[PDB]
Design a protein around this ligand. Sequence first.
Ligand SMILES: [Cl-]
Ligand SMILES: [Cl-]
Ligand SMILES: [Cl-]
Ligand SMILES: [Cl-]
Ligand SMILES: [Cl-]
Ligand SMILES: [Cl-]
Ligand SMILES: [Cl-]
Ligand SMILES: [Cl-]
Lengths: 226, 218
Amino acid sequence: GHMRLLSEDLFKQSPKLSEQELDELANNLADYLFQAADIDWHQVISEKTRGLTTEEMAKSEHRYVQAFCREILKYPDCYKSSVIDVALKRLQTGRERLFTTTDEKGNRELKKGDAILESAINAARMAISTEEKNTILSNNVKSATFEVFCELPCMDGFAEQNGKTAFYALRAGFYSAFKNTDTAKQDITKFMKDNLQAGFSGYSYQGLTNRVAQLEAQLAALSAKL
Amino acid sequence: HMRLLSEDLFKQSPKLSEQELDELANNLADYLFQAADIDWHQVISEKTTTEEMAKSEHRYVQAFCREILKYPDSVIDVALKRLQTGRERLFTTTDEKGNRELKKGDAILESAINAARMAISTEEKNTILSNNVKSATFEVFCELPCMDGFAEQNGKTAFYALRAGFYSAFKNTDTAKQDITKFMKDNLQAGFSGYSYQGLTNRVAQLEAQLAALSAKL
Ligand SMILES: [Cl-]
Ligand SMILES: [Cl-]
Ligand SMILES: [Cl-]
Ligand SMILES: [Cl-]
Ligand SMILES: [Cl-]
Ligand SMILES: [Cl-]
Ligand SMILES: [Cl-]
Ligand SMILES: [Cl-]
């Protein structure tokens, strides 16, 4: 995903954008949300492999399981006593325990179980299309994209700054944004654009306080003409 | 009072009658002033004539030093550093009569502080605190059950705004109590909803209804 999406002051400068740049940013933000959305790899890999051999796993029709197992199988002492379920156990139970593989140059190499798992998972993330990932996500896409949204640098201290209540209101608005199952992209793009234009000031103490002050002035300047 | 310690004070306060609200606000204010702590190691360090201390203009300065003098060891500023370093260490002591006693380092510092405390009234504390009454009382306000989890629920920003509103409510050191009472009364009436997501979003909504209603008049 683009660099501009990752600015920490994104919410600050978004309202200073042109309605052209704003549309671009919102579409890109949306695209980034779907692209980076995660799934339960521990679950979907295990489901795709349980009952199969090491070689069978190595040449599956799923490129993403192929990439996953390729990483795992480098460390025989992690699965060699299903293998996938064994490795998942041993790697997590053995996080910070050093596993052994053989380098390309024939040297010995040790790597922490947790790094091994994160790598295997990253490889699978690299080998799946957004299309298949979304099909696997189903309607949990709403929670997976929101999880990505909350990880953005611009969302860094949202809950702590604006409070639990505001944060959960934001979540509700986010979930509610998804109207039709076949307009996901279009919908969340609109929610993003509306809020980016206002810098998400609908969920902040200062944004709301300012709007109240604005309204008091607007009411005053109106009740005057009459 | 009993209502002051309710964790749901802000929920129940908007439902109070004028009489009850005014009483609550006044009780709350009194509590803040009663419970407020004084920065003594700063008050007296800034108010310090070894002998003129014995019968000084301020009754609280003599009491505090009258116990720091008993022990052999700006000198009061030195005694503070030698005592805050004392702890379990015992300070040699003497009496006018033969009898010689002892009192551990910190055991001395508290008795001096305590003497100062017992020598003053609440409305003397306010004069002493002066401008510091702002944060002293606010620190007490924040320990109340009703104020628990305020920042977590409403956010740090709204909490800092509350503090700012709380501080600014203090106009003159002489009206400190009357001023903070009004701040408390106004907010208690509103349940402090001026500092919450729902309160502010409710406010925006009805104001937008008012504005539109009066605009359509054209
Ligand atoms: Cl590029
Ligand atoms: Cl190997
Ligand atoms: Cl690649
Ligand atoms: Cl971050
Ligand atoms: Cl957050
Ligand atoms: Cl909402
Ligand atoms: Cl839906
Ligand atoms: Cl704003």
